[PDB]
């Protein structure tokens, strides 16, 4: 249950955006693009990949959890630069949960990858980081978004 309000706070107690990016998160409305395909339940969103990682290698290392119906690594539309994150569509929910629990931290091309579900069509009110918000973040970069798997709430 995404709430851009409490997402900027460690324990869900903030009633006023401490960052304009939070303020942008509340105002902006988000809908998944036409490139968002497949059943959202089986899309294992992975991030923090190496920009030199190819979509075949992702299929190669993520096939050990079972058969993979579809996969896409996201690259910049005009330039072609890899955006550093992909979307893995699996078959049978047994495979994706196995992908959930073990693949987080799995080193790929000298990077500790991040693994989560697809939270667009499942997490209510979800807002990506580009629209202000998202999850994770780094406290170094003047902002942070708690409530995710990386940074759960201090309840």
């Amino acid at each position: 249950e995404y709430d851009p309000l409490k997402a900027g706070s460690i324990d869900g107690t903030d009633e006023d955006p401490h960052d304009r990016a939070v303020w942008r998160a509340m105002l902006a409305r988000y809908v998944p693009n036409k490139g968002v395909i497949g059943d959202p339940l089986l899309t294992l969103f992975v991030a923090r990949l190496n920009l030199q990682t190819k979509e075949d290698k992702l299929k190669e290392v993520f096939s050990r959890y079972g058969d993979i119906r579809r996969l896409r690594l996201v690259r910049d539309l005009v330039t072609g630069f890899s955006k550093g994150y992909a979307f893995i569509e699996y078959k049978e929910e047994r495979a994706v949960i196995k992908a959930y629990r073990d693949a987080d931290g799995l080193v790929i091309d000298q990077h500790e990858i991040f693994v989560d579900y697809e939270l667009e069509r499942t997490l209510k009110g979800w807002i990506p980081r580009r629209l202000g918000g998202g999850l994770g973040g780094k406290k170094e970069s003047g902002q942070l978004r708690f409530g995710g798997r990386d940074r759960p709430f201090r309840k």
Binding site: R75, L77, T79, G80, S82
Partner: protein, 128 residues
Amino acid sequence: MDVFQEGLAMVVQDPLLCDLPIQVTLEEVNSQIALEYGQAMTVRVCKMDGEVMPVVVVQSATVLDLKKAIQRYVQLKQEREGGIQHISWSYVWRTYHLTSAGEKLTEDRKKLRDYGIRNRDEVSFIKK
């Protein structure tokens, strides 16, 4: 009320005309006119996934003119394959640079010949 489309389609089948991408339009054919006259030059751009797009400009084309040619090429590409059409070119040119032989094409006013770019060359992208 589009009888011209049929004529353009069969005419493209000319073996000395297969280079043309179905819909011809004036700027594309006119650019290839200067190719025969030698005034134009092709500057290849490769996306980071390896796909290459042969952008064509004039010899005296400036860097900023080259930028619009990429916009003209990409935008023309999108309608034919039906991809994303409303490309935020303000953002794309805000974050990415143009580089050739390790030198970033920063001066939009400068012309490609001084930047060392010749015909059938290659330039790539890099972030700010």
